[PDB]
Write a protein that binds this ligand. Structure first.
Ligand code: NA
Ligand code: NA
Ligand code: NA
Ligand code: NA
Ligand code: NA
Ligand code: NA
Length: 370
């Protein structure tokens, strides 16, 4: 079914697949084994279909959170890196690729939101959320605003909501406790209260969405936004001299953005598991391998320490990794699907006044733990 003696790799069409193919060509030169890199449409839908019948690629690349469902269906091989190899990657990245206590993928790259700021409006960006109200008053007096970011989606508001002690699900022992949910605790209530107050006191509008925040920042109307590495290429550097830094703290605690870890899984049905391990450990997860992919399409921050130390000479990448290290690995369990919709509703209702902050989060907590 899956052909022995070659590697077929699937990766999304927004990634550096020409760079990956060059890594494959080096592997083929050293081993005589053909590597075929493909970027099919809807690969994350296709993989569980073909893998369920014992078919598909030998290696799949995707964000780690989707691999939980794949691992629940036994579609991914348990990987076997030795302890010395594991020590070459930042330890938090291995946690992202554990399911039911077992390692099911190799971490490649790390993504998280950062604070993006306009250096000509704000050469010294605020280190705390608590400073932002006063800063907004000063900037509004000069015809600008302090901060605009997407308020409609919990991915973007969670960093603040969770800073003072919120969390989705408690992680321990390579597993999550589905009964230990941090959506209606004191810290979450404090952060959502602070967000709602930003709106009540006219520092942000409740209808601000992704489009508005991006346009406002690119036009030089707002000093700051919150966004991820996918947004950098769109920032009009002709008009905006921007920096990227650590997110502000709240009550002295770091903001807690969700962390996505681009990961490489090995099909459980592959007869090429040793070749796949060799390719991933000793060709891709090297400075030269990650450089080839990154040159094609930037990976952002990477899990491999040796190469991250080079990439972090770019302060935007250094900030991405700092915010990731302080953030919350996105849980890979099925109960996380309940989290997104429950918290989305809670934030919308609190920002509109439909619900008090406490009731909004209480209702979300009840749905997530149900
Ligand atoms: Na070839
Ligand atoms: Na090839
Ligand atoms: Na084999
Ligand atoms: Na080092
Ligand atoms: Na170098
Ligand atoms: Na509760």
């Amino acid at each position: 079914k899956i052909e022995e003696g070659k590697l077929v790799i699937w990766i999304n069409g927004d990634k550096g697949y020409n760079g990956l193919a060059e890594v494959g060509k080096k592997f083929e030169k050293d081993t005589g084994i053909k590597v075929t890199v493909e970027h099919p449409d809807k690969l994350e839908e296709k993989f569980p279909q073909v893998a369920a019948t014992g078919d598909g690629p030998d290696i799949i690349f995707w964000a780690h959170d989707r691999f939980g469902g794949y691992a629940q269906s036994g579609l991914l091989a348990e990987i076997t890196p030795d302890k010395a190899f594991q020590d070459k990657l930042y330890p938090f990245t291995w946690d992202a690729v554990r399911y039911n206590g077992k390692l099911i993928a190799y971490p490649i790259a790390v993504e998280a939101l950062s604070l993006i700021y306009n250096k000509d409006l704000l050469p010294n960006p605020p280190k705390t959320w608590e400073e932002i109200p006063a800063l907004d008053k000063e900037l509004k007096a000069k015809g600008k605003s302090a901060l605009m970011f997407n308020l409609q989606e919990p991915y973007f508001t969670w960093p603040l909501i969770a800073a003072d002690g919120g969390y989705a699900f408690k992680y321990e022992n390579g597993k999550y406790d589905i009964k230990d949910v941090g959506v209606d605790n004191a810290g979450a209530k404090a952060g959502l209260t602070f967000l709602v107050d930003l709106i009540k006191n006219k520092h942000m509008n409740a209808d601000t969405d992704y489009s508005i925040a991006e346009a406002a920042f690119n036009k030089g109307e707002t000093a700051m936004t919150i966004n991820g590495p996918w947004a950098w290429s769109n920032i009009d550097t002709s008009k905006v001299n921007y920096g990227v830094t650590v997110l502000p703290t709240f009550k002295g605690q770091p903001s807690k953005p969700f962390v996505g870890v681009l990961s490489a899984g090995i099909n459980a049905a592959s007869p090429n598991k040793e070749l796949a391990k060799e390719f991933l450990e000793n060709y891709l997860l090297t400075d030269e391998g990650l450089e080839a992919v990154n040159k094609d399409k930037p990976l952002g921050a990477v899990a491999l320490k040796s190469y991250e130390e080079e990439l972090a000479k770019d302060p935007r990448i250094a900030a991405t990794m700092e915010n990731a290290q302080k953030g919350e690995i996105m849980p890979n369990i099925p109960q996380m699907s309940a989290f997104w919709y429950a918290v989305r509703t809670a934030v919308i209702n609190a920002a509109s006044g439909r619900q008090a902050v406490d009731e909004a989060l209480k209702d979300a907590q009840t749905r997530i733990t149900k």
